[PDB]
């Protein structure tokens, strides 16, 4: 940076602390990642100066010839990545991407079936304090209480009883592969649309490491950050037949002008994801998650669903008589960043929890491998098995420092 | 830029074209501006890597100590600028800022009174193709057909007849000062909340050149771009009594995690707006708009409301027997960027229009003064009075080139 340190010492000092913190800590929050310098340069571009309400070649304002090239690069690269017929790269966020799909196919008060929030479902999949739950009538399907795998007979029974206009699949804390084919079969039985929110797993999908929802879902929403390792934002994919309606839902339906500089950053990230080395990166993410899961089980930890098929894992801390809140706090003390997370059939409130959620996308981006996974699990064991020992915690702090350099 | 040109030649080539276009053209779109290099550096920062769902010191995720400093700098600087008791700097956009206020105080189907869209009202103030018009029952007040000034007796009669739960004031194409005191008196008479969307005029308000809606409105929404000259995004201001509800409407109500890098950019822009030279800048904007209005009238043009009190003006092209669409296209041919805009009681559709909208914020940022305003008006006269003369248009093209260098 050149001008910010001179113009705004206060903002610069705080950014610099944040930059140093990102390096110093072990980031295990499952939705986090580190973007390339190219992605950040695109976001820091003069494209913030351009109003581009509408769509490429169908703008409401002149002078869009070049930002049209940027948006089309983003759309076409997204279509190539996911094999989708249409892309809308304008959503400001995952939340707005979901909001727009809901606005497209639902009327106020319509019934929607989504994954139980306590079992891994997202806030925008029916929380009563979220627009989703307030605006629509959400019902929930659950995971098996033993296997913690989505109970597809429960999805079906709920769909047949409640007759939802829309079924939502996807999750913020589900460590196994989701069967989109079964979701579509159920959707078809009851005449419902299928929406898949692939925010967490989008990078894995792009690398062919998770089945692709695009052939099964009427609408696929996603963030461009998380496993996809792009800038913060949203995106909708759909078949040609829904394209005009989806575009109209984003604008003029729920947003105004798009963030063209962020759209440029999306294009960049999609370019990166189309490369072979992103495929290798994504495989290391899943390889690291399995390895981390195995090493944690070696420490004596119980994992929700007994392991992982993707980038993330959930520790059930009940055997250790610890809450997720307690675990999250003590790990913070040693430089390991997790979040407390409800587990299926959690006896504790969402504010306390019996679990912690862990993902490997961020540490994998940093170059961490299988050896590092074994060491992270060993540090987590040392800490959670010795919560009252300041000596244990200091040793952990030093081992964390050894990992981050 | 260093890494983008190597990583993504296609995206870089298009950004570079856009950068060169911004310099080469005369930007008269009233909502446009050019941000500082400090603002862009903040947006291009590693803060894109941080998930910070919740609010400063009340986050749902750890590691937010530094991004909390950034967000509080933004909130406190906004509060100082506008004399507000509370600020929410998380809205992704002006649209989402409005959406959140609506979500706070209204139920589906509630009546809302806003400015007639054909008279300068915004898309999110009741368009039937926008969430606002679909979700709520919007009624409209108008401007006087002669003076083009808001008819405050019409605001009152509409409010008394329709009994709105909320009254919205503010506009995208209204060139006179809005009387917020009268809006509040009407709101109080009928027991309605008052929302002021100050997106266009926020920089002028900050510089004390437009009356401040904060003391009169229950809720003030705004963009951080436009006259405020910040990054693209939204903000809500309100009194302490509404703070918790507004914050909850943004999250968990209508968004998820905020864009922390954009929030950093908001802080930077607010820092700039608190400086004396921003006050001088804002005065030049309004001085330039009056001067431009006067010079256009000198060319024989008719202006909506007969001039301007702010940054923007609307040309009524009916005397020249031209549509806004025609004018917009021919000005584009010579390097002058305007938008066609409906005028009050426009005989033409919103897609054709009888007007063009012009603002001075962008050219003022570039250093243009009164002399440049006289020349811009002279070029516009040459072009619109000679639409069929390629020689006139070439002369205009060269005079535009002389202005931009």
Automatic annotation (TrEMBL), chains A, B:
Annotated binding of pyridoxal 5'-phosphate 3, by residue: 51, 94-95, 122, 172, 200, 225, 257
GO cellular component: cytosol
Pathway listed: One-carbon metabolism; tetrahydrofolate interconversion; Amino-acid biosynthesis; glycine biosynthesis; glycine from L-serine: step 1/1
Gene Ontology molecular-function annotations: glycine hydroxymethyltransferase activity; pyridoxal phosphate binding
Residues the record lists as binding (6S)-5,6,7,8-tetrahydrofolate: 117, 121-123, 240, 349-351
Organism: Geobacillus stearothermophilus (Bacillus stearothermophilus)
Protein name, as recorded: Serine hydroxymethyltransferase
Database matches in InterPro entries: PyrdxlP-dep_Trfase, PyrdxlP-dep_Trfase_major, PyrdxlP-dep_Trfase_small, Ser_HO-MeTrfase, Ser_HO-MeTrfase-like, Ser_HO-MeTrfase_PLP_BS, SHMT-like_dom
């Amino acid at each position: 940076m050149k001008y910010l340190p001179q113009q705004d010492p206060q903002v610069f000092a705080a950014i610099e602390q944040e930059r140093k913190r990102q390096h110093a800590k072990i980031e295990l929050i499952a939705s986090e990642n580190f973007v390339s310098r190219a992605v950040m340069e695109a976001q820091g571009s003069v494209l913030t100066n351009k109003y581009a309400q509408g769509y490429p070649g169908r703008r409401y304002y002149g002078g869009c010839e070049y930002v049209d090239i940027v948006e089309e690069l983003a759309r076409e690269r997204a279509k190539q990545l996911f094999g989708a017929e249409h892309a809308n790269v304008q959503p400001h966020s995952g939340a707005q991407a979901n909001m727009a799909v809901y606005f497209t196919v639902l009327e106020h008060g319509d019934t929607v079936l989504g994954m139980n929030l306590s079992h891994g479902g997202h806030l925008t999949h029916g929380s009563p304090v979220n627009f989703s739950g307030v605006q629509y009538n959400f019902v929930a399907y659950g995971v098996d209480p033993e296997t913690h795998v989505i109970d597809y007979d429960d999805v079906r029974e709920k769909a047949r009883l409640h007759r939802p206009k829309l079924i939502v699949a996807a999750a913020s804390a589900y460590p196994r592969i989701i069967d989109f084919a079964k979701f579509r079969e159920i959707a078809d039985e009851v005449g419902a649309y299928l929406m898949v929110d692939m925010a967490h797993i989008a990078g894995l999908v792009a690398a062919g490491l998770h089945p692709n929802p695009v052939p099964y879902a009427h609408f696929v929403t996603t963030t461009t950050h998380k496993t996809l390792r792009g800038p913060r934002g949203g995106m909708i994919l759909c078949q040609e037949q829904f394209a005009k309606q989806i575009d109209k839902a984003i604008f003029p339906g729920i947003q105004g002008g798009p963030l063209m500089h962020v759209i440029a950053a999306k294009a960049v990230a999609f370019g990166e994801a189309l490369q072979d080395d992103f495929k290798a990166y994504a495989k290391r993410v899943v390889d690291n998650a399995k390895r981390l899961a195995s090493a944690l089980q070696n420490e004596g930890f119980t994992l929700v669903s007994g392991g992982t098929d993707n980038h993330l894992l959930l520790v059930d801390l009940r055997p250790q008589q610890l809450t997720g809140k307690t675990a999250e706090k003590v790990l913070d003390e040693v430089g390991i960043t997790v979040n407390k997370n409800t587990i299926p059939y959690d006896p504790e409130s969402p504010f306390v929890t019996s679990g912690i959620r862990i993902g490997t996308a961020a540490v994998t981006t940093r170059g961490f491998g299988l050896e590092e996974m074994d060491e992270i699990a060993a540090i987590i064991g040392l800490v959670l098995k010795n919560v009252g020992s300041e000596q244990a915690l200091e040793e952990a702090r030093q081992r964390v420092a050894a990992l981050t350099d």
